Design a protein around this ligand. Structure first.
Ligand SMILES: CC(C)[C@H](Nc1ncnc2[nH]c(-c3cnn(CC(N)=O)c3)cc12)c1ccc2c(c1)S(=O)(=O)CCC2
Length: 168
């Protein structure tokens, strides 16, 4: 149904909210939920682990079957799989993990995958344990995504920092 509520409008197509992406998916029922995935689709922690746990491991089992037939993704790449109880579809997107020596330029490639879907609920790619500067990740999102993107950022301190930096 895509009923998003409580979002701050940053640009004509980019919205942001201090929220847990799992709680937003349950409330919104979006057509597309974005997962901050790794190349083998192993959802062992962070945003991916939270989404997987909310599908009671159904997402991991489907992900394993996809990798068996198609092999791993590339950094900056994506795949569309079932959204299970959270969404119609899950778009698994691999942003670079600069904490593992991956190239930050690939974050543009990662956000470009959003352009194939008219409206998506997403996290801030490559932020948290992936090591990218969150302010930079929001700027790449604003400059690269043209479709309607609702960003859920589960940290009030980071949310206010991103909003102040964007309004500067
Ligand atoms: C910047 C950070 C605040 C943000 N976190 C999140 N942003 C939005 N929705 C979230 N839900 C949870 C969560 C964590 N636990 N639970 C309960 C559960 N049952 O697991 C829900 C965390 C989360 C963030 C954004 C991007 C990435 C990561 C973290 S990561 O996982 O460290 C590496 C991949 C890229």
């Amino acid at each position: 149904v895509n009923s998003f509520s409580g979002y701050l409008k940053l640009t004509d197509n980019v919205y942001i909210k201090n929220a847990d992406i799992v709680e937003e998916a349950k409330k919104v029922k979006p057509t597309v939920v974005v997962n901050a995935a790794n190349v083998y689709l192993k959802h062992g922690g962070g945003v991916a682990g939270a989404l997987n746990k909310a599908t009671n491991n159904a997402m991991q089992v489907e992900s394993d079957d996809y990798i068996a037939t198609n092999g791993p993704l590339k950094v900056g790449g994506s795949c569309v799989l079932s959204g299970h109880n959270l969404a119609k579809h899950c778009l698994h997107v691999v942003g670079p993990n600069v904490n593992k020596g991956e190239d930050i330029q690939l974050l543009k490639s990662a956000y470009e995958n959003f352009n194939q879907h008219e409206v998506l609920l997403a996290p801030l790619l490559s932020a948290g344990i992936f090591g990218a500067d969150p302010i930079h990740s929001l700027r790449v999102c604003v400059d690269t995504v043209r479709t309607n993107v609702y960003l859920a950022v589960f940290d009030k301190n980071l949310y206010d920092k991103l909003v102040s930096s964007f309004l500067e």
